[PDB]
CSV table of C-alpha atoms in Angstrom, one decimal:
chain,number,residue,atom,x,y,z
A,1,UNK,CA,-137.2,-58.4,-2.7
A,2,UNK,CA,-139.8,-60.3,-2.6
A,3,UNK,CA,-139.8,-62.0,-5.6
A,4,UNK,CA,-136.7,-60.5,-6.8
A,5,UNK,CA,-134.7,-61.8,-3.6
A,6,UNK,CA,-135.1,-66.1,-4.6
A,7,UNK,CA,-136.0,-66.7,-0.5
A,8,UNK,CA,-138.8,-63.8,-0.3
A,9,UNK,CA,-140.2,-64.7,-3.6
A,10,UNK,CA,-140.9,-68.9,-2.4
A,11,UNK,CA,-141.9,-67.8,1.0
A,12,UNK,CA,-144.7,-66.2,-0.7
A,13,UNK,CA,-145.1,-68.2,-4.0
A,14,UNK,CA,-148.6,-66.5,-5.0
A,15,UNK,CA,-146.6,-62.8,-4.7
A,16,UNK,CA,-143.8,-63.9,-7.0
């Protein structure tokens, strides 16, 4: 995570 992990990436869009 986060945008490794596909959920904690699109919960914050902008930080993936």
């Amino acid at each position: 995570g986060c945008c490794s992990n596909p959920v904690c990436h699109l919960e914050h869009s902008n930080l993936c």
